Design a protein around this nucleic acid. Sequence first.
DNA 1: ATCAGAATCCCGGTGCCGAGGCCGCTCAATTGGTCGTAGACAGCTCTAGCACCGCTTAAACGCACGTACGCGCTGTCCCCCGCGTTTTAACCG
DNA 2: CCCTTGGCGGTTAAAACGCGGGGGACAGCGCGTACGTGCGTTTAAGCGGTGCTAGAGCTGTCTACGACCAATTGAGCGGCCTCGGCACCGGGATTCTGAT
Lengths: 93, 93, 82, 79, 98, 95, 33, 107, 107
Amino acid sequence: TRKESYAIYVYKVLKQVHPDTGISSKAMSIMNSFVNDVFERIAGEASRLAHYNKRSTITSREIQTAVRLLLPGELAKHAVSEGTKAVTKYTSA
Amino acid sequence: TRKESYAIYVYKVLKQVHPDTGISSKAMSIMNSFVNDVFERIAGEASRLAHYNKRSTITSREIQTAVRLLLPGELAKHAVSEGTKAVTKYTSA
Amino acid sequence: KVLRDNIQGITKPAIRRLARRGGVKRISGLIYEETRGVLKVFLENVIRDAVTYTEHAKRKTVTAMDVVYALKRQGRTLYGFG
Amino acid sequence: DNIQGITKPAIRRLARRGGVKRISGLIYEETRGVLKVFLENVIRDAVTYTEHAKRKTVTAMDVVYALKRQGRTLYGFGG
Amino acid sequence: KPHRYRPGTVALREIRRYQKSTELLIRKLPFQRLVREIAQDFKTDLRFQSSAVMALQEASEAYLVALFEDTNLCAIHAKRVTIMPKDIQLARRIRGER
Amino acid sequence: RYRPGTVALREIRRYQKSTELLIRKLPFQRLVREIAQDFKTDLRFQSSAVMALQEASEAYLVALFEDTNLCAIHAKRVTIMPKDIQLARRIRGER
Amino acid sequence: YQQMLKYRGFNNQIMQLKKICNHPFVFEEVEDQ
Amino acid sequence: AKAKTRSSRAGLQFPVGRVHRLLRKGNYAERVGAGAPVYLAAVLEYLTAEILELAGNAARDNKKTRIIPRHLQLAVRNDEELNKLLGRVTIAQGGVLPNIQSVLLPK
Amino acid sequence: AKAKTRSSRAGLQFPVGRVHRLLRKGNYAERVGAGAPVYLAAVLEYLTAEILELAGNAARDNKKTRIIPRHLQLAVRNDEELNKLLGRVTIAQGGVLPNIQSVLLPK
DNA sequence: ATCAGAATCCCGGTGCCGAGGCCGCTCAATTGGTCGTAGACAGCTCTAGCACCGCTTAAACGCACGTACGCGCTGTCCCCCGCGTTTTAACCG
DNA sequence: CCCTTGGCGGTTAAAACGCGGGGGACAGCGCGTACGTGCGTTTAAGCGGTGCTAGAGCTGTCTACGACCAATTGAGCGGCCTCGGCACCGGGATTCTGAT
């Protein structure tokens, strides 16, 4: 049985922000439950937005509006900025 | 465009409980939004219970546990009683 | 057309009546402005959620359904309007 | 019994963490009552999720789904 | 001398009166202009259905009624019959709204 | 001897400084088992589950004493009272 | 033996018989009644 | 053979078929069992029957033979369990239960 | 041709493919677009980067090079927006921000 | 402890617009068949959970004692209520 | 195409403004008792270590069961009519508040 997690990814991002700082296993578990939490939130709001507008497909627009609903203020603005840049670079190349 | 509702059904149940009493249109709208609300609650809890236990099928057991989670106390007991009786009579005949 | 001082349109007797229904016997003179601030905050929240829904649907009209989804979005369910 | 096993110094410490300076002598019984309430509310849900899976063991995931079920989210124990 | 009620009786009669009926306590047009002003800061040139404004009026009035209930509980807990701003912001501090 | 109220403040800084759990394991575990007896008999508990109930319970009581302290201070008193607790639980909507 | 063995709350089946053949009074409620 | 509605088999007044459709197209799970719409429809029938029962009793107490949102507000909030379920709900045209704190009354 | 990961195309460290799978099997909608996992993974990367940034700053302020749950409690609650997002969250081993009401201090 | 009197309940009468029943007209609910597959059931492994005692020691408990503060009481003053008059913006069409 | 916005005019309930004054917010003061604080004494918590085994966890079949498509039709719905329960009013009897 292989149970996957986000551990190595939070580790990589941590080494990007603070290359000299490590993280304990418990804090890694907290980060994992955080990523799963926020993921389920944005996915749920995307499902609601897709159901109310009568569409069967989740696109980047529904995820964008869901981010603008969940994240207050600057988290929403910078989050939509980073995500839009990521989809931009993704489909451009 | 035909927009369906629960109006006539709440009307029938009302005529079962109180045959002599009528209901205003606004109260019928409140009852409609109530039935839709509770429906989305039980269905959502059933989806969560089906996802956590790793099963792709919603059966009467998941709906039962969802009712026992949402409805406090006697509403849960009598609700599970009536529902179990309904499935009983349904599959029996 | 810039609209200003419309929150002052909420009248002292109005808020007074709301408190009379809420069970308040005697009201201090400083309740009013604070109540206007709180109401303005609440309306900013609910209206930014509803207008967000309306922007997502590419519609120019804010339907009552959007307001219901904003209130249910915040955790306050409003029956009767859909 | 058991609920009395929660000690006057324990509740005293929990109040010291919350910022309470001085404590009345009647806070203890009320705190035990509230704790018993909350524990019943969470444990009935955790036992519900346990019985649904047809298991005799109450795991950490059941308690996490009971806390998230009641609106208080917990991290670090899985989710 | 003109007959006058002792202070606090009219307030109680108003309590029973307004708690008796379902009437809406805020006038339509001012509340609608307020909603439109607040909505101007988000997206310009928006259309509102009447049932939407009525919805915001229902939720707003009910929210303020509950807020004045809890505020009244705070004021009475302070051994005072007069609610104060610190009672309001106290209730909004305990509810977790700030 | 210290003036009354100084040791209380030093304890406030001490316990607010660390992460230590303030309730002893075995009594809390026996309490959880007793409360669980009334639902389904003969249940098994993992250690992480009891630890979870201890985390949620202690955090909940800490927040409850924070809001209760806010009520007592709003009453112009430094001593929390049961009416402050049940007041906070009345305003939160838990009763 | 047959009644308390018929109860089958947990771990008792071994614990129940060792006590009752030694003492009935080790159980608090039994000694009380 | 003549088609008989599944709602009439279990003795339910609610549309078991419609509930089944909403469970299929509601994006809840990938598959839906055969007992879910019957059981769920029965639960909804119990809840609706109770709330309409209390609403009818309140309407009879107010000497009105037509149920109004006020009678739903009273019928719900006067009941403990339905108040615990609907505690987060704001009912339109509901009003407030008549209440006065005993300390505010003259003496 | 040599397969290149979609996470490396957009410049994301998070598994765009795994997010896509979770959106497909999560019973969210019936169909999932091609920009949803990229955009969502980017948002998660921003949030994680911020919370780990504040956690690293708090750890550096406490003279500890290993992040502990206390540093997450402080790093979150000291920030306004993350406190507004996580306000309903109870973090294990978090503790409480040091606070004393100014009226309780001696004078 | 009691009448003057202002507000409220009660009762009879009247007019109306929404509740309630009817009637085409669908289109989704029911039936009949297949077809693959999720899970029901039996079996096997072995891990962590259960009870218990030995032994040490940090914490709890009981108690003596002081004084800090909660609460009752009093006086002051100020400010919000009850009512009249006048104006205006809500309301309805 | 229908529901929103905009305008206009007439009514009038409601809001603003003022003005006495009585009761409640607030400060001060004093008492008594209840809780903090420290010390000696128990006492179970914590840690360890033993013995057992129940049920978590995984697998392998194998089959009833639900998805899916074709055929069919009747339950529910939109449009359309009554008519009566309830809003509104006008008068009278009753009740609750306040100064003798």
